[PDB]
Amino acid sequence: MMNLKPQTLMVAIQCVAARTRELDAQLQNDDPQNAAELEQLLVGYDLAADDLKNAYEQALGQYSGLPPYDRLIEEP
Amino acid sequence: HMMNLKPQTLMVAIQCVAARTRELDAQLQNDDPQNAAELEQLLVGYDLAADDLKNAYEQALGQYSGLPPYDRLIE
């Protein structure tokens, strides 16, 4: 039940967004490797991303000066 | 007592940060010191996040049954 620190939330959000773009790039490759498995992972990454985003929207009211959420998830 | 992140979110985060940390460690052995300072600053941050994640996941291991050991996540 503890909260995560806002700094932790930024690191996690940026990390999962990058991993998500990495797997999307693989899947759009001409002859894809392990597609079923990448799609299963991506379900999980999206759920984690959505949960992080909710926690960050709380942080924005509590810790000053944080970037807008759309900046953290920018490509790049 | 309020973000209420799900255990599974913490698992994905833990794994993601451990992987990004190994990536930056690898890059530091490529023999290009150009941005070594910058990668080392980032690595401090990644380690801080990893510690905070680890704390939170240990709470989860106390509230819920059948979650994987922490060490399995960071292998």
Swiss-Prot record, chain A:
Disruption phenotype: Deletion of Tsi2 is lethal in the presence of Tse2.
Gene3D superfamilies per UniProt: 1.10.287.2500
Keywords linked to the UniProt accession: Disulfide bond
Pfam families: T6SS_Tsi2-like
Leader peptide range in chain numbering: none
The name this protein goes by in its record: Immune protein Tsi2
Classification via InterPro entries: T6SS_Tsi2-like, Toxin_immunity_effector, Tsi2
CDD domains registered for this protein in UniProt: Tsi2_like (cd11690)
Protein species of origin: Pseudomonas aeruginosa (strain ATCC 15692 / DSM 22644 / CIP 104116 / JCM 14847 / LMG 12228 / 1C / PRS 101 / PAO1)
UniProt keyword Transmembrane helix present: no
Function comment: Immunity protein that plays a role in preventing early activation of toxin Tse2. Binds to a large surface of Tse2 and thereby occludes the active site to specifically inhibits Tse2.
Subunit structure and binding partners: Forms a heterotetramer with Tse2 consisting of two Tse2 dimers and two Tsi2 dimers. Formation of the complex inactivates Tse2 enzymatic activity.
Swiss-Prot record, chain B:
InterPro entries reported for this sequence: T6SS_Tsi2-like (IPR049070), Toxin_immunity_effector (IPR053756), Tsi2 (IPR033783)
Pfam families: T6SS_Tsi2-like
The entry's keywords: Disulfide bond
Description of the deletion phenotype: Deletion of Tsi2 is lethal in the presence of Tse2.
Bilayer-crossing regions: none
Subunit structure: Forms a heterotetramer with Tse2 consisting of two Tse2 dimers and two Tsi2 dimers. Formation of the complex inactivates Tse2 enzymatic activity.
Role noted for this protein: Immunity protein that plays a role in preventing early activation of toxin Tse2. Binds to a large surface of Tse2 and thereby occludes the active site to specifically inhibits Tse2.
Protein name (Swiss-Prot/TrEMBL): Immune protein Tsi2
Species this chain originates from: Pseudomonas aeruginosa (strain ATCC 15692 / DSM 22644 / CIP 104116 / JCM 14847 / LMG 12228 / 1C / PRS 101 / PAO1)
Gene: tsi2
